[PDB]
Design a protein around this ligand. Structure first.
Ligand SMILES: O=C1N2C(=N[C@@]1(Cc1ccc(O)cc1)OO)C(Cc1ccccc1)=Nc1c2ccc2cc(O)ccc12
Ligand SMILES: [Ca+2]
Length: 189
């Protein structure tokens, strides 16, 4: 699996432009870690009835991940600065990856999966992913939810493993792998 950066590639830039706009819900071109964390805890974790240890763990991983791309409490971030912090984040993540250090996306994924299956298999139902796709808004369609489960190497119960999603995410967000292309269907270019 690919480890080199492709930050100058217009396809990588467009992918995170889509996600920035998605985070810029009010359309003014600025986002804050304050909004992101609110979305994580007050909107996603509260709705899923996660435990305080689980909510704190999820919020800790979200804070770390977006501080990794230069966000911070009280700071308004516009897309050029977001994009430049994403080069730094992806470079950090590939370095930790190449040393078998837990990546920030690995740690966030563990925290998300721990909500749906509690502590155990670390696998999620489509019903459970559809729920996540709608709550987080990253994939509010019940149709797009279906295509990701068809794109991923699933297991024998028709359930998705955070091991699988983490591998797909390192391709989909960091290095632009074509078998990571399609991870979120046509819902994220
Ligand atoms: O990976 C996941 N993301 C997201 N929820 C995730 C969570 C997840 C699921 C399974 C895993 O194994 C690992 C993580 O579901 O995909 C949200 C949704 C979200 C944003 C803020 C606060 C709460 C939620 N935003 C982005 C993103 C990934 C890269 C981004 C790159 C960008 O420029 C921008 C956004 C994301
Ligand atoms: Ca905004």
């Amino acid at each position: 699996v690919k480890l080199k950066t492709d930050f100058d590639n217009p396809r990588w830039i467009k992918r995170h432009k889509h996600m920035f706009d998605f985070l810029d819900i009010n359309g003014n071109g600025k986002i804050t870690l304050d909004e992101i964390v609110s979305k994580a805890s007050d909107d996603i974790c509260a709705k899923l009835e996660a435990t305080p240890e689980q909510t704190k763990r999820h919020q800790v991983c979200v804070e770390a991940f977006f501080r990794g791309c230069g966000m911070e409490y009280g700071k308004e971030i516009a897309f050029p600065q977001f994009l430049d912090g994403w080069k730094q984040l992806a470079t950090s993540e590939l370095k930790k990856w190449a040393r078998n250090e837990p990546t920030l996306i690995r740690e966030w994924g563990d925290a998300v999966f721990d909500i749906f299956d509690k502590d155990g298999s670390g696998t999620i139902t489509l019903d459970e992913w559809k729920a996540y796709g709608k709550i987080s808004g990253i994939s509010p369609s019940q149709e797009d939810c279906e295509a990701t489960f068809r794109h991923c190497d699933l297991d024998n119960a028709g359930d998705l493993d955070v091991d699988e999603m983490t591998r797909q995410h390192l391709g989909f967000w960091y290095t632009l792998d074509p078998e990571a292309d399609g991870l979120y269907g046509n819902g994220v270019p």
